[PDB]
RNA sequence: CGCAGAUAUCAGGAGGAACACCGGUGGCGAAGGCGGGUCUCUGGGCAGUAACUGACGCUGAGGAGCGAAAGCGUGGGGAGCGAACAGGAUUAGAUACCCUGGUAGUCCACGCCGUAAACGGUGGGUACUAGGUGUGGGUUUCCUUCCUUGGGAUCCGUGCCGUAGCUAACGCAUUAAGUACCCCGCCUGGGGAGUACGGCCGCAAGGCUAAAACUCAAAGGAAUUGACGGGGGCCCGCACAAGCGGCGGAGC
């Protein structure tokens, strides 16, 4: 089966980057990450990993039958818009952007400082 | 590299008992202990033999090869023991610092 | 202000403290 | 050049051919001032290629140069506990120059009994797409592919 | 006709400017009520957060009164708070 | 940690600490300290009117009470963080930084101890002593719209700059470290030492009170020049980078 239009979640952090396609309901069809692209350890914060990962996942979604996407981004990402360019290169229509990085209302204690 | 520390004992003009040689080789092994990068240790044991001296009878120059940076420790005292130990501690400062900055 | 003074203070304090950690048993079970 | 660079030398044109990459070639194969020896070696080799191919050797030379001349290479940098290699684009000047350097230095270790023959056969091999020069250039591109990740440095 | 300052011509102005503003007693008001959300939506951003005094102009009195009203409003869901 | 179906994603529920944007040289509290919201109970301060008593004031040894955090006890609860502790990695070796995990503890009730750089390193009370400048609160008059950092004057609190004056200097300066009175505590060379002995308190940790022998000829405060810096900013040199040939390998 297939879905023509869905949604996309993009989680970019300091040490990794990952994406996932999904219906607006929450049901995934396809995902990818820099670990499946092949990079390892410390290289996979670069935006190049974002390009390749998002590209592979978008092609998987093209396979399973997607043509338009809603896009939701999350986290400290050097290569957010890099992944966006990769997606729109892969042949998909950008539905709606939203920079929902989860901020708390001064809740749980974070860890200590480093040096 | 453990006997590769190229010992160089020497004195221009001093009565050099051969147990000073034991002292020197042992005090240089002591830093073989914590620096495995060592090729050359040229060393002196000098004496100015002036009358009515300025508190500084004997003198020592020491230089050592490392991989690139060479080390240099100079000292001065009345006799052999303070000279050895003082140049040793100056080298220890150098080498602690060098192996702190090496990484 | 300096810190040399406070450091000498600190060292005396610490050594007395560790002494008490080591003699916490003997002081109690002697001086009753 | 903390204050700034200086000009490049004005290459001459060849008396015979009409191309300054050939004087560049003799000046890169030169060794111990024997410029005329370089000249006669090169002219003999190019005419060997002429009798090998029935045409001008210059065209196959520039074709070999099109094969072995990159436009991308490496430029290292020490950063954060682990030195990183980086891709950097290469202007055509240094591209041609480094290509010729590859060409000579991998010509020298051949077994044609003579430099003129080694060189001529290497040029033919690179025009055809077989020389160790081409091999090393492919290794360079392999490295740039392995290290595309560090282009955002833009340096 | 006249300059924003060097007002040597009119009386001491009952008007407000870019440094000075007391925006509520100025205008845009019925009364400070957590009921009237259309008014309270003016002292925010589209992201729901709250303005500052050197943005708005209010005295701390009105500022804190309004913030408390806003916050009661978010509690009673009369106002779209920032969230999922 | 997963490959026994993780991470991600979505629907829901359980759950306990902290409550972003308001919120900062800003308000209150004697001090410590104090913000998610609503209700209850209660305290303090400010201004004005200045109707009332008519010097009742200020301080305060001793003493009582409050008092950050970590700790202790009985009980409850326990998501995240995390002493200790285990492992990984760096390391010459790392009982340490870094990573993974993780107990006591952090939280609540009732009691304890009663200390800190508990700092404005400035005890409290009071009068006079050049000013300017922002700012929080409350009064009030004029250009008066009288819907205004309106403006001016005044009172209280709070910060910056700056006279005289003062201080070893730094710098303080109408909120004084200035000018003067009243009361208290405290210091009298450094160390030994806020240590021991003795005592009081405390469940315990421990705190308060507190010496001597002996020893040194100094311990120190502020500031200047210099040198140094794996502090910063501006620059140069075959200093590296680019490029060529050498050395170390062998023989003389």
UniProtKB/Swiss-Prot annotation, chain A:
Gene Ontology process terms (BP): translation
Keyword rRNA-binding: yes
Signal peptide interval: none
Protein family per UniProt: Belongs to the universal ribosomal protein uS11 family.
Region (Disordered): 97-115
Function: Located on the platform of the 30S subunit, it bridges several disparate RNA helices of the 16S rRNA. Forms part of the Shine-Dalgarno cleft in the 70S ribosome.
Superkingdom: Bacteria
Portion of the full sequence shown: 23 to 137 of 138
Keyword terms: Ribonucleoprotein, Ribosomal protein, RNA-binding, rRNA-binding
GO CC annotation: ribonucleoprotein complex; ribosome
Subunit structure: Part of the 30S ribosomal subunit. Interacts with proteins S7 and S18. Binds to IF-3.
Transmembrane annotation, as ranges: none
Gene Ontology MF term list: rRNA binding; structural constituent of ribosome
Record's protein name: Small ribosomal subunit protein uS11
Swiss-Prot record, chain D:
UniProt KW Phosphoprotein keyword: no
One cellular component term from this protein's GO annotations in UniProt: small ribosomal subunit
MF GO annotations: rRNA binding; structural constituent of ribosome; tRNA binding
Pfam entry (one): Ribosomal_S7
GO BP annotation list: translation
Domain of life: Bacteria
Gene3D superfamilies: Ribosomal protein S7 domain
PROSITE patterns linked to this entry: RIBOSOMAL_S7
UniProt keyword terms in alphabetical order: Ribonucleoprotein, Ribosomal protein, RNA-binding, rRNA-binding, tRNA-binding
Record bears the keyword tRNA processing: no
Recorded family membership: Belongs to the universal ribosomal protein uS7 family.
The protein's assembly and partners: Part of the 30S ribosomal subunit. Contacts proteins S9 and S11.
Known function: One of the primary rRNA binding proteins, it binds directly to 16S rRNA where it nucleates assembly of the head domain of the 30S subunit. Is located at the subunit interface close to the decoding center, probably blocks exit of the E-site tRNA.
The protein's name in its UniProt record: Small ribosomal subunit protein uS7
Swiss-Prot record, chain E:
Naturally occurring in which organism (per UniProt): Mycolicibacterium smegmatis (strain ATCC 700084 / mc(2)155) (Mycobacterium smegmatis)
GO cellular component: cytosolic small ribosomal subunit
Record key words, sorted: Ribonucleoprotein, Ribosomal protein, RNA-binding, rRNA-binding
GO molecular function: small ribosomal subunit rRNA binding; structural constituent of ribosome
HAMAP family assigned: Ribosomal_bS18 (MF_00270)
Subunit structure: Part of the 30S ribosomal subunit. Forms a tight heterodimer with protein bS6.
SUPFAM superfamilies: Ribosomal protein S18 (SSF46911)
PROSITE patterns listed in its UniProt record: RIBOSOMAL_S18
Family under the similarity heading: Belongs to the bacterial ribosomal protein bS18 family.
Functional note: Binds as a heterodimer with protein bS6 to the central domain of the 16S rRNA, where it helps stabilize the platform of the 30S subunit.
Protein name, UniProt field: Small ribosomal subunit protein bS18A
Annotated GO biological process: translation
């Amino acid at each position: 089966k297939n879905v023509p239009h869905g949604a996309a979640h993009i989680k970019s952090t300091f040490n990794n980057t990952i994406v996932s396609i999904t219906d607006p309901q929450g049901n995934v069809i396809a995902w990818a990450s820099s670990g499946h692209v092949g990079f390892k350890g410390s290289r996979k914060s670069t935006p190049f990993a974002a390009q390749l990962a998002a590209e592979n996942a978008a092609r998987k979604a093209q396979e399973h039958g997607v043509k338009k996407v809603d896009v939701f981004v999350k986290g400290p990402g050097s290569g957010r818009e890099t992944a966006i360019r990769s997606l729109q290169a892969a042949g998909l229509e950008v539905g709606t952007i939203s920079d929902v990085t989860p901020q708390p209302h001064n809740g749980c204690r974070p860890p200590k400082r480093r040096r | 590299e453990r006997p590769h520390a190229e010992v160089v004992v020497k004195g221009r003009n001093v009565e050099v008992p051969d147990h000073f040689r034991t002292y020197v080789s042992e005090k240089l092994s002591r830093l073989e202990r914590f620096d495995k990068t060592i090729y050359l240790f040229d060393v002196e044991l000098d004496h100015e033999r002036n009358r009515r001296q300025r508190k500084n009878c004997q003198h020592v120059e020491i230089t050592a090869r490392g991989r690139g940076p060479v080390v240099r420790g100079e000292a001065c005292a009345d006799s052999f023991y303070t000279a050895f130990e003082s140049a040793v501690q100056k080298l220890e400062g150098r080498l602690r610092r060098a192996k702190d900055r090496r990484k | 202000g300096s810190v040399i003074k406070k450091r000498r203070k600190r060292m005396s304090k610490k050594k007395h403290r560790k002494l008490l950690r080591r003699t916490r048993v003997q002081r109690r079970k002697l001086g009753k | 050049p903390r204050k700034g660079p200086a000009p490049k030398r004005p290459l001459v044109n060849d008396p015979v051919y009409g191309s300054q990459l050939v004087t560049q070639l003799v000046n890169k194969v030169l060794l111990e001032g024997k410029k005329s020896l370089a000249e006669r070696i090169v002219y003999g080799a190019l005419e060997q290629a002429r009798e090998k191919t029935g045409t001008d050797p210059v065209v196959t030379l520039k074709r070999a140069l099109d094969n072995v001349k990159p436009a991308l290479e490496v430029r290292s940098r020490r950063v954060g506990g682990a030195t990183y290699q980086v891709p950097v684009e290469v202007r055509p000047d240094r591209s041609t120059t480094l290509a010729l350097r590859w060409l000579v230095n991998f010509s020298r270790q051949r077994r044609e009994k003579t430099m003129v023959e080694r060189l001529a056969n290497e040029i033919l091999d690179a025009s055809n797409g077989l020389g160790a020069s081409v091999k090393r250039r492919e290794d360079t591109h392999k490295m740039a592919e392995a290290n595309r990740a560090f282009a955002h440095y833009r340096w | 006709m006249m300059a924003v300052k060097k007002s040597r011509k009119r009386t001491a102005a009952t008007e407000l400017k870019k440094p000075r503003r007391n925006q509520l007693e100025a205008l845009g008001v019925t009364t400070i009520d957590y009921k009237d959300v259309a008014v309270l939506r003016t002292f925010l951003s589209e992201r729901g957060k709250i303005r500052s005094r050197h943005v708005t102009g209010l005295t701390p009195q009105q500022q804190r009164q309004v913030a408390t009203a806003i916050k009661n409003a978010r509690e009673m869901a009369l106002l779209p708070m920032a969230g999922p």
